[PDB]
């Protein structure tokens, strides 16, 4: 009776389309936010503090052409992947603190084998494990299709650690970052439109790196205006500054909770 069933959003790489991918990212955003908290037109993610554990997580079920299924657990507060589940085994990133350690105990309670990596899920660490930086790692339906397969086979013993790290960077950007950023989502749609694999450019990468900063700048903003500008990059890697909220609205879909409204 007890174990909590978290919302499940299904997506499959098999015969995937721009439409079905857009529908996927919207459903994920739908589950991550009620949309109850909005500052400057941007939906805010639920406050981690005081958050009941039944509202804490959502599940992403991934399927590919190979007919393999892999389930990801996403933290509703940061919209980030805390770990995943394949068959009878579950795997979790090393938690950043004892409360998060406690939280993930409510996940994947029906698996036989439960594992916690010695490493966390941040890009830097994941990049060291993969042996490749995000700028050298391709994104698209192909890679995601490949990432799904590698996640599944890791229990098998059929996936090398670097490959597993590579697949995480793939999954995380193509799902979490897509959900956080309409722009990033838009960059993934473009890969699907053209059936291309491409590693993300500086414009995408600095969005990922600045996400926390932007949420803060937006929530602390005075009538939309920043105290200090934030530097971002054009697709060509050239810098440019954002002094205010209006410019970010088409860009960032979700904000981490910083201050109360």
């Amino acid at each position, epitope marked *: 009776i007890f174990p909590k069933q978290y919302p499940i959003i299904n997506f499959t790489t098999a015969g995937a389309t721009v439409q079905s991918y857009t529908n996927f990212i919207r459903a994920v955003r739908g589950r991550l936010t009620t949309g109850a908290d909005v500052r400057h037109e941007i939906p805010v993610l639920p406050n981690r503090v005081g958050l009941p554990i039944n509202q804490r997580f959502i599940l992403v079920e991934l399927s590919n052409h190979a007919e393999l299924s892999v389930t990801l657990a996403l933290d509703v507060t940061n919209a980030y992947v805390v770990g995943y589940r394949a068959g009878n085994s579950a795997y979790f990133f*090393h938690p950043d603190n*004892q409360e998060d350690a*406690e939280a993930i105990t409510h996940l994947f309670t029906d*698996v*036989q*084998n439960r594992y916690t990596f010695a*490493f966390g899920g941040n890009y830097d660490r994941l990049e060291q494990l993969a042996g490749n930086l995000r700028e050298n790692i391709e994104l698209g339906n192909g890679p995601l299709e490949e990432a799904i397969s590698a996640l599944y086979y890791y*229990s098998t013993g059929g996936t090398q650690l670097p490959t597993l790290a590579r697949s995480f960077i793939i999954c995380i950007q193509m799902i979490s970052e897509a959900a956080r950023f309409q722009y990033i989502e838009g960059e993934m749609r473009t890969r699907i439109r053209y059936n291309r694999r491409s590693a993300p450019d500086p414009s995408v990468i600095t969005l990922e790196n600045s996400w926390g900063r932007l949420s803060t700048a937006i929530q602390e903003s005075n009538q939309g205006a920043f105290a200090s500008p934030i530097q971002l990059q054009r697709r060509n890697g050239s810098k440019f500054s954002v002094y205010d909220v209006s410019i970010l609205i088409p860009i960032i879909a979700l904000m981490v909770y910083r201050c109360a409204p």
Partner: nanobody, 116 residues
């Protein structure tokens, strides 16, 4: 499939030492974190150590800090917990799992430690 078997449990006297072994079988635990928990009668499981890598530094709960020591022999594929200066309140069954600071999931038989 990697699994863990605890060993080293015994009966000890106050101030004594003991050495527990968490042995992996069907693969490397090298990149897995390994926690140690203990349960005492009429009491809930409590977390003792978090051993990461290699990788991260090793975390101890304050009460066992400097008393208890974790180490790894890679290729022996085992995580050790060396218990030192044991008190009767260190009594209980000791479990090793891959996880830290909080656990439900299977333990595990554990290996018994009695200090009298």
């Amino acid at each position: 499939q990697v699994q863990l078997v605890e060993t080293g449990g015994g009966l000890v006297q106050p101030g004594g030492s003991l050495t527990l072994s968490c042995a992996g079988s069907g693969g490397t635990l090298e990149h897995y974190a390994i926690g140690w928990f203990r349960q005492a009668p009429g009491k809930e499981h409590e977390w003792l150590v978090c051993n990461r890598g290699e990788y991260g530094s090793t975390v101890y709960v304050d009460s066992v800090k400097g008393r208890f020591t974790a180490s790894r022999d890679n290729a022996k594929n085992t995580v050790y917990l060396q218990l030192n200066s044991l008190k009767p309140d260190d009594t209980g069954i000791y479990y090793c799992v891959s996880g830290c600071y909080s656990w439900r999931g299977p333990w595990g038989q554990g290996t018994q430690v009695t200090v009298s």
